[PDB]
Design a protein around this nucleic acid. Structure first.
Lengths: 93, 17, 91
DNA sequence: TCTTATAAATAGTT
DNA sequence: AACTATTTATAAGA
């Protein structure tokens, strides 16, 4: 972008909204690309700062959610804390 | 994903549509 | 990247797996960033080519899924086909 | 809403 | 398992 930012809460309401719309599209585009390149099925659920709902699924949201409920093994599960841990361990790359 | 109430509620929600 | 690639299925098995691991992390990192910048809560559910499950939630998947079941209002819902259409429009 | 200058992610090679 | 040149994403402008 025109200037480097740090990852922290945006307090300006207008900027928050603009950033949300742009980065939401960017996230769905990366999901699309991963789904096609690697033959994945993907769902994404987003609640904004007022808990309005936005969703994406590569093909069919209901199919992905029901497969989730049918899965009965341990699997990779991450949160923001895991992402931060990976960033702390990774190189400047 | 495992035996519990959250699994049950999600399944019911999807199927009821 | 060193070259532009077409968005189509990778048939080389090694390359598919390398690409999957790298881009899965990239997608989760962008989700972390959006969650902090814009004060939102996000979940991701991924089934790979082998039908193995990978998940991410900014804080708690249980809470996101329960809230999802309560939401009644019309809302944005997009699929790959919609993304492809937007990219046509963007040119 | 689109463009533009700049930062971030990643494809190919190692 | 690392490196880097380049393509892609996006922060601030129009």
């Amino acid at each position: 972008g025109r200037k480097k930012i740090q990852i922290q809460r945006i307090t300006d309401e207008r900027n928050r909204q603009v950033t949300f719309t742009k980065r939401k599209f960017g996230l769905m585009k990366k999901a699309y690309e991963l789904s096609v390149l690697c033959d994945c099925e993907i769902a994404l659920i987003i609640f904004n700062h007022s808990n309005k709902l936005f969703q994406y699924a590569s093909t069919d949201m209901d199919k992905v959610l029901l497969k989730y409920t049918e899965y009965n093994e341990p699997h990779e599960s991450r949160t923001n804390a895991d992402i931060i841990e990976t960033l702390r361990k990774k190189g400047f790359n | 994903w495992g035996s519990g109430e959250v699994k049950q509620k999600l399944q019911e929600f999807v199927l009821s549509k």
